[PDB]
Amino acid sequence: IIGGHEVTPHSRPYMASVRFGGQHHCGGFLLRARWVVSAAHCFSHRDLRTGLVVLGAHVLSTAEPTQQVFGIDALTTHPDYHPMTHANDICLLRLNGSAVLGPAVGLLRLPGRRARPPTAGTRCRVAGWGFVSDFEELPPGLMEAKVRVLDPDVCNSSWKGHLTLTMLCTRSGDSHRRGFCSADSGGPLVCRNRAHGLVSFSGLWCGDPKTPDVYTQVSAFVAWIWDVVRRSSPQ
Ligand SMILES: *[C@@H]1O[C@H](CO[C@@H]2O[C@@H](C)[C@@H](O)[C@@H](O)[C@@H]2O)[C@@H](O)[C@H](O)[C@H]1NC(C)=O
Ligand SMILES: *[C@@H]1O[C@H](CO)[C@@H](O)[C@H](O)[C@H]1NC(C)=O
């Protein structure tokens, strides 16, 4: 997270850390006890068995008593995911057990099945354990930046017309660079307590207004998410 601040430990109980080979790779969020939503691009060419999902975390390096670590039983990538464009950059992770909910582990609500994306100007918050600068510097713990939704057409112009309809963007409320960075991918964009966006991609410089922060527009995938969860209910 760029231009953010460290959160009060366990104040975002839905935050998930997706590890590969022991190291934190991407973010995600707890949807249900055995379901985590993350970004499709986080799992490309990766052996699922090398992956772990950490809930109830603050300081990733500490074996915190609130931490709940799980294995991935099944990765369901969006069938129409396009790595070249980041179209449909969403996936579901079925955990090898059910998270025990409490103060440090909770769920984040999805938008309405047919909800519109948030309008330009909507105040949102984005969290992660990704880089805090363009110098590959890791945060002390879970971090969060305050962002505002940016006009999708203005965003599309800055991205030289490569955005899809199911994408939304953000900007900082002020002159300071605020947004996500590498390893924040898959983490949610929370606007009025709903997961409206999911960290997808950005430019060479984190939070740079010339290459605005692009998110997967979550509301367009709610019907798909529930159909995956439901069809995997009997197992
Ligand atoms: C995004 O914008 C596209 C148009 O972009 C413009 O045309 C291309 C060929 C380049 O010249 C580019 O720099 C221009 O900005 C639209 O075709 C596309 O439908 C738009 N996408 C959405 C979701 O609105
Ligand atoms: C879940 O998977 C991880 C990694 O494969 C493993 O260490 C853990 O024991 C598994 N848990 C259960 C309940 O099978």
Small molecules in complex: a molecule of 2 linked components (NAG-FUC), 2-acetamido-2-deoxy-beta-D-glucopyranose
Distance between the termini: 37 Å
At CATH level 3, the topology of the largest domain is: Thrombin, subunit H
Give the ordered list of helices and strands: EEEEEEEEEEHEEEEH
PDB class: hydrolase
Keywords: trypsin homology, peptidase, hydrolase
Assembly: monomeric
Entry title: Neutrophil serine protease 4 (PRSS57) apo form 1
Q: How would you summarize this macromolecular structure in one to three sentences?
A:
The protein is mainly beta and 235 residues long. The chain contains two helices and 14 strands; from the N terminus they run ββββββββββαββββα.
Describe what this molecule looks like in 3D.
This protein is mainly beta and 235 residues long. It folds into two domains: 1-12 and 108-219, Trypsin-like serine proteases (Thrombin, subunit H), CATH 2.40.10; 13-107 and 220-235, Beta Barrel (Thrombin, subunit H). Helices cover 7% and strands 33% of the residues. It is built from two helices and 14 strands, in the order ββββββββββαββββα. It has helices at residues 152-158, 222-231; strands at 5-6, 15-20, 23-32, 35-38, 51-55, 68-70, 72-77, 91-95, 123-128, 143-150, 167-171, 188-191, 194-201, 213-217. It has a seven-stranded antiparallel beta sheet with strand order 6-5-2-3-4-8-7, covered by helices on one side. The protein starts with a strand and ends with a helix. A molecule of 2 linked components (NAG-FUC) binds at residues 156-157, 160-161, 163-165. GO terms for molecular function: heparin binding; serine-type endopeptidase activity; serine-type peptidase activity. The active site is at residues 41, 89, 185. It is found in: Cytoplasmic granule lumen; Secreted. This is Serine protease 57. Residues 1-230 form the Peptidase S1 domain.
